[PDB]
Design a protein around this nucleic acid. Structure first.
Lengths: 48, 146
RNA sequence: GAUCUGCAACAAACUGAAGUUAAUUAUCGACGCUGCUCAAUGCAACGAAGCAGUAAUAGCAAUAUUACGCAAUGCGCAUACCGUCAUCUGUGAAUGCAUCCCUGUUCUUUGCAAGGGACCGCAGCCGCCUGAUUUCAACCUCUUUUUAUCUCAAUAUGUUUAUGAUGAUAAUUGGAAGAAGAAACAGAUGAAAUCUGAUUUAGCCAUAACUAAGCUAAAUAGACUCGUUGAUAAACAAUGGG
RNA sequence: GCGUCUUGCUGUGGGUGGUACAGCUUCUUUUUCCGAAGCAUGUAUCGUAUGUUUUGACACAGUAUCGUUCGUCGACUGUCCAACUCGGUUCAGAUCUUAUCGAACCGAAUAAACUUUCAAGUAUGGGAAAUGGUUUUACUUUUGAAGUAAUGACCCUCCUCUUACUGUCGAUAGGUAGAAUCUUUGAUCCUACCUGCCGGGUUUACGGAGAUGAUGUUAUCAUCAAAGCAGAAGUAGCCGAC
RNA sequence: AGUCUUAUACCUCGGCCACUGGGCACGUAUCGGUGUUUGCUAAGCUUUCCAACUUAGCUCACUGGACAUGCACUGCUGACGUCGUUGAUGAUGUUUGCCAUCUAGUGUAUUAUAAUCGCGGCCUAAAGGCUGCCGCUAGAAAACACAUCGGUCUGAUGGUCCCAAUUGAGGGAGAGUCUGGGUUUGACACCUUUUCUCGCCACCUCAUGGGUGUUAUAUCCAUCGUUCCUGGGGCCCGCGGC
């Protein structure tokens, strides 16, 4: 994404790509925390 | 909005920093041990005039020795080992605090290689649970328990 | 020092004077007493005359007025506050898990385990009110026989017509709380509702000059919700034809 | 079980104080000739402090951002450590590889393993810590603004365990509060406190207008309390520094 | 025959072809709207009769849109000291900041050289093996051209160290045998292909039973599970056509 962000020059496309990054890395962090917590319960169940 | 755009770089950089901290700390706290057990016997002379069936007193102590080291390097697992600085108090506005925390963490985690050494210790333990029996030979009725 | 390229410093003088002296011009303190200042402006507190804003009038003057000036006051005006409501945002307690801090003092028949406090992060009970509303009966009452609505059906008449009601709802007779709202009683908004000149027209004035600069009245047009109320125009989802 | 005024919710309804301005009418005046009277209705207002011509308009000169930690003087020091080095800068110079050596400087570095010692110097907790006061409840139910409590708590109070935090002097530096003397109405002296500066809620305490109840005295005794100061607070910007 | 221009050839034939970064122009699938005539599609006036004109448009041109081509070409990005001002910025030298790669395969040569064997390093010291750089080929428009709602949900079992029965299965390796292919002549011999046999082949996987270890290990293996693809016979559901 920063490959295109480096040279865009058009504010509309700039803000739309920033929104794309927002949504994408938001989904990334959400799935990160969900995976971490689900593997926490997974280890708890394995120990039990 | 501009400040909340922080997550982009602070969230994953902090996540990877904690990742490297964990992957170094788990290997650094190995706490290696080594131990062994033997059942060497202990002999106590018995006077012959005592007319005992067994000539020599035998003890079987559980002999246990263990030697272990730590091998910690010269570094700062202390104050730097802290939870996310923002935690739940992101409402406090700052831009320099995060960069100062990051550079401090970086310089600390870079400066460890200079020294690596620690101490050790060893134990020598005996356990006795010997309940021995001896007969007054030629007189099986007479008997002694130790 | 390139060394037949020159530069730097030593501040005594040199035209250009950055300060004062030498001379000229202008000003004020021109009275300085406890004392004359960062070189000048400047006085808790020192001395006299006259009245204690200036000018004029009838008047020494007080006295009364006027013109200017000064001071004070008044939601008269506004400013910050709260007083004031309204709309909206917003509706609550106990339960665990996860983090940090401290701790051999009866720690210990394996040298390394066990206790106490903190708030955040993650999961666990149910109601309530407000915003504003659906629960119930129209089941004796024939001359003092509530109305309206969602509605039906037999019979007579070869018309263009005549009759009989159960269930529910409303005109709120009663209550839950729901259509919107997990940590409660606090915040946010409002205290507005017009203006143009910038369009035309009409009228006044001859205009700096041209008679009509400029001004006045009507209408058009343009800028214009401060949050609350509703619908409407368009894109969004709308399978097509013979 | 019944009837009753008043009282508290005004529970319901009604009427009522209005002022100013806007506008209308009437008389005089050249119908508001620059004056006067009455009147329908509407709006605003019926709070504090501030500014009231510091209200407004024209000219001159000037007005960068962000984020930092600090800021009455000097003294050993209440207080910073690897102090004899690290890294860089510059240079009288030398060996002349671009290179090497030497000197000064800069930033890091000397206090002591803190201070403190009436043992919470200042905060934290516990007491089979009692008195007294206050706040609940119960009982008698009658007490002199009635009484009694093996009462739930708080305050007061004595003792007591850990942890945190902190020297003084010369300043007659500046200021603050109290007290006294003289008096200029300010000054002087002494005591106590504070100093990066000057800025918000809350918490504790102080004195304290006025008010309230009682008593024999406009007098006294008890209760509340206006405004204000002080301990943490908690948040601006003021210059200087980056 | 002479001159100019376009096209091929001609060096390039956009910086690459891995990206037209953008601009320019003509060319064009061409599409809408106008200027639109000689003549024309259908209709029509003035209705016995259309046997004499016009109308909506059509040739062509212009306008706007779209596509493509090459390039004489050009850019994309604006901050330091600024300069007098202009409100925002008009200029000055400046420097930094671009579309610009990764992946898979291949690699000389000479030769008797420790002489290598595209270039260079590692292990073993042999008839060597591993790896870094470069050269030559293909994919990746990834890259510049190019993608645009939120929120929620979306597999298990056992093994993996050793041993025992080879107990069974499957797969690999070897030895031969045979069918054919390649060098050699007529061959043999060697390489290679296919069929079959073989097994103390501690080869691998699975199946069985045990034990060892805590430092057995798979970033996996095997089995099943859901979904998808291919061939669909057919009925439970089941209609249409024949």
């Amino acid at each position: 994404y920063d490959r295109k962000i480096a040279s865009a020059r058009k504010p509309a496309i700039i803000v739309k790509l920033r929104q794309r990054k927002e949504k994408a890395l938001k989904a990334l962090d959400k799935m990160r925390v969900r995976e971490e917590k689900k593997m926490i319960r997974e280890f708890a169940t394995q120990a039990a | 909005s501009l400040w909340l755009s922080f997550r982009y770089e602070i969230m994953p950089l902090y996540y990877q920093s904690q990742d490297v901290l964990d992957v170094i700390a788990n290997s650094t706290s190995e706490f290696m041990t080594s131990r062994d057990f033997v059942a060497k016997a202990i002999n106590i002379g018995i006077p012959l005039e005592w007319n005992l069936d067994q000539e020599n007193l035998v003890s079987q102590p559980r002999h246990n020795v263990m030697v272990k080291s730590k091998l910690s390097p010269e570094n700062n697992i202390g104050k730097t080992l802290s939870v996310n600085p923002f935690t739940t108090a992101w409402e406090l506005l700052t831009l320099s605090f995060v960069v100062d925390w990051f550079v401090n963490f970086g310089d600390v985690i870079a400066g460890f290689t200079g020294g690596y050494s620690d101490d050790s210790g060893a134990t020598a333990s005996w356990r006795f649970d010997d309940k021995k029996v001896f007969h007054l030979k030629n007189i099986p009725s007479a008997m002694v328990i130790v």
